[PDB]
Write a protein that binds this DNA or RNA. Structure first.
Ligand SMILES: [Ca+2]
Ligand SMILES: [Ca+2]
Ligand SMILES: [Ca+2]
Ligand SMILES: [Ca+2]
Length: 511
DNA sequence: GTGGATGAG
DNA sequence: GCTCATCCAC
């Protein structure tokens, strides 16, 4: 065409962390450390990524390495079942707390699969610690925060990156990058760079057409192109290619410094990014161009239920409520309401109003349908761009134990368990303090139990600190007092042995 | 006040 | 299957 399909406004928008995600030109990444717990144990025990390791808790498998999966092992399997699929399996049990001890510890060469009765990790007196995974995640997150100025911690093993600044800055100012032996970005993109510093454009003006010398710019990773479309046809393509390069370097850092492999989804929107990181794994990168967004969504592997918020009960409700076919529901949503979000909105209002349609258990806000339609309209088209957003502050933290057998028959027994809970909540407060770079101190403690016959007892109250700071010993002390008060409360009633015991902290001052 | 429902996979 | 934090009809 004569001009690009994009404006200067939308390009310059890339350079503002608050608005960059709204640009059609946005370059978002979703990076997943797959089989995270297995990777962490592999690296700790000096093993390779091709070693069939399985992370184990009790008799179940919680993480399965991709090497282990070659043998048909899945989380579905027990350790005994997985060992009949691959006798060379390397099960590694999580760290555990022992009842009464204030620290966790690894019991290597111990597990329910080893014959020696000496080398067991009894479920009855032990509690699992996920601290080693928390810590490793923290190391990753610091390396991500180092390479990019807007990182969302989507979960323990997944982040989103907004690569707009980085990309926009490469595009305009990076005089070091070279496409070939003789070709450099500064020469190839001299026209866009001279126009931009010149300042003579109107922001709403369309961009200049991309130069031919940019078409040799290489994507890093696997560009999803079923229909064999051209790789670089406009500026959104240029930014994305740059992103993939930047994104590869970041992932190599994770591998170089910590040894973890990742999958990466690169695209304009967060939901499309997450689909792509999962599309091939492990150690892979998938780029989804804007012009392939419909090729990607329609490939066959996705349905309306594949999206972040639609994976569960609300997802089903929509299939029902929108009479969507059990295949190509996304496409089906595009064509039925082809022109605008509102068409979906009115339909919803009509279905919204029906005798069969519940109002009581409905996961659908009647007031909030305006947005629900726009979400779906745009999600169906791969243009639903949310901002990268910090997770809100914690309100509650809990550490409990499901007790079986008669281990818990006394106040003394309960107190041994509280020690483990305190130990654990202390290390979790610490993870939080680093995440926030702020002191976190809880003012309220709650002690909960379930009796022999599954009745619930509970006691909340303040915890006081002799110092300005938080001290685990003051949390325990209050816990002990509550546990003791509940003992008296249950004297000639159904009580021991307990079947469940827990500690919860709330009312944090993030001073 | 909170048991139960809910999200991912 | 499980997890744990978070939300809200009861
Ligand atoms: Ca994952
Ligand atoms: Ca002790
Ligand atoms: Ca995960
Ligand atoms: Ca185009």
């Amino acid at each position: 065409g004569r001009m690009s399909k994009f404006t200067w406004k939308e390009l310059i928008q890339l350079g503002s962390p608050s608005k960059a995600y709204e640009s059609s030109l946005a370059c978002i990444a979703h990076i997943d450390m797959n089989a995270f717990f297995a990777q962490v144990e592999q690296m700790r025990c000096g093993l390779s990524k091709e070693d069939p390791v399985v992370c184990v808790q009790w008799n179940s498998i919680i993480a399965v390495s991709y090497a282990a999966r070659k043998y048909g092992i899945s989380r579905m399997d027990t350790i005994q079942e997985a060992l009949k699929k691959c006798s060379n399996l390397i099960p590694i049990h999580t760290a555990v707390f022992k009842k009464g001890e204030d620290f966790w510890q690894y019991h290597d060469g111990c597990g329910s699969w080893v014959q020696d009765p000496a080398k067991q990790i009894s479920v009855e007196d032990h509690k699992v610690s996920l601290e080693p995974y928390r810590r490793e995640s923290r190391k990753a997150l610091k390396i991500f925060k180092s390479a990019c100025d807007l990182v969302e911690r989507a979960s323990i093993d997944e982040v989103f990156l907004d690569l707009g600044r980085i990309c926009f800055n490469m595009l305009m100012f990076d005089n070091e990058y070279e496409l070939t032996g003789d070709l450099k970005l500064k020469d190839a993109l001299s026209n866009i760079r001279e126009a931009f510093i010149g300042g003579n454009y109107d922001i709403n003006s369309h961009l200049p057409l991309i130069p031919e010398k940019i078409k040799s710019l290489k994507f890093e990773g696997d560009v999803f192109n079923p229909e064999g479309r051209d790789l670089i046809t406009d500026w959104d393509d240029v930014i994305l290619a740059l992103g993939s390069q930047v994104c590869k370097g970041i992932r190599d850092s994770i591998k170089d410094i910590l040894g973890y492999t990742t999958s990466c989804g690169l695209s304009s929107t967060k939901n499309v990014c997450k689909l792509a990181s999962n599309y091939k794994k492990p150690d892979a990168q998938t780029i989804v161009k804007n012009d392939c967004l419909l090729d990607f969504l329609d490939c066959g592997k996705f349905e309306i239920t594949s999206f972040w918020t639609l994976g569960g009960v609300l997802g089903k409700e929509l299939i029902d409520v929108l009479d969507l076919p059990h295949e190509n529901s996304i496409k089906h949503i595009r064509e039925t309401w082809p022109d605008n979000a509102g068409q979906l909105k009115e339909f919803l209002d009509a279905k919204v109003k029906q005798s069969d349609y519940d109002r009581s258990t409905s996961n659908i806000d009647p007031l909030k349908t305006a947005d629900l339609a726009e979400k779906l309209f745009k999600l169906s088209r791969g243009r639903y761009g949310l901002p990268l957003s910090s997770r809100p502050v914690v309100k509650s933290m809990m550490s409990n134990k499901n007790l079986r057998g008669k281990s818990c028959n006394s106040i003394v027994d309960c107190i041994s368990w509280l020690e483990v809970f305190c130990a654990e909540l202390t290390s979790r407060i610490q993870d939080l303090e680093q995440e926030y770079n702020k002191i976190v101190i809880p003012r309220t403690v709650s002690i909960s139990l379930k009796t022999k016959s599954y009745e619930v007892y509970r006691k909340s109250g303040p915890v006081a600190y002799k110092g300005i700071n938080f001290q685990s010993h003051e949390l325990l002390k209050v816990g002990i007092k509550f546990v003791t008060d509940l003992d008296i409360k249950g004297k000639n009633k159904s009580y021991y042995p307990l079947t469940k015991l827990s500690m919860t902290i709330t009312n944090f001052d993030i001073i």
